[PDB]
């Protein structure tokens, strides 16, 4: 049973990456299971819908009353030291929101960190069906 824990927004870095204060420590968090267009893409640069995905994540978290992080059942940090989690803004999962709006694709999934994979895949099929943003 996954558990939500509170966190505080420090800074939004990109559509899929945010800096949070978690248990008294500043930490970078990578949103689990989603890939957004990048503004800080190592190789390309500024990709289409990158600025949009990135403003969406920022506004969604900045305007929330309550931010919570939810770790999955596997590793909780990646090789870059980033926390790996589902992020909630007033009860709503940012990761699903991005996918539902066609501003993210469902990433390649590594068990065992794949607990919400089916839900997100269903949100992605709808955005596709609706031909939103990335899908238009």
UniProtKB/Swiss-Prot annotation:
Residues 116-136 are annotated as: Disordered. The active site is at residues 30, 38, 82. It comes from the Bacteria. Coiled coil: none annotated. It is found in: Secreted. Ca(2+) binds at residues 16, 35-36. Residues 116-132 have a biased composition (Basic and acidic residues). This is Nuclease A. The lineage of its organism: Bacteria, Bacillati, Bacillota, Bacilli, Bacillales. The chain holds residues 88 to 223 of 231 of the full protein.
């Amino acid at each position: 049973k996954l558990h939500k824990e509170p966190a505080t927004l420090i800074k939004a870095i990109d559509g899929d990456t945010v800096k949070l204060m978690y248990k008294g420590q500043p930490m970078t968090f990578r949103l689990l299971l989603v890939d957004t267009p990048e503004t800080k893409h190592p190789k390309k640069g500024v990709e289409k819908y990158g600025p949009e995905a990135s403003a969406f994540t920022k506004k969604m978290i900045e305007n929330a009353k309550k931010v919570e992080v939810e770790f999955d059942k596997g590793q909780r940090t990646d090789k870059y030291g980033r926390g790996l989690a589902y992020i909630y803004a007033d009860g709503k999962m940012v990761n699903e929101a991005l996918v539902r709006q066609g501003l993210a694709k469902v990433a390649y999934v590594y068990k065992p960190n794949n607990t919400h994979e089916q839900h997100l895949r269903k949100s992605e099929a709808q955005a596709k069906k609706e031909k939103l943003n990335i899908w238009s």
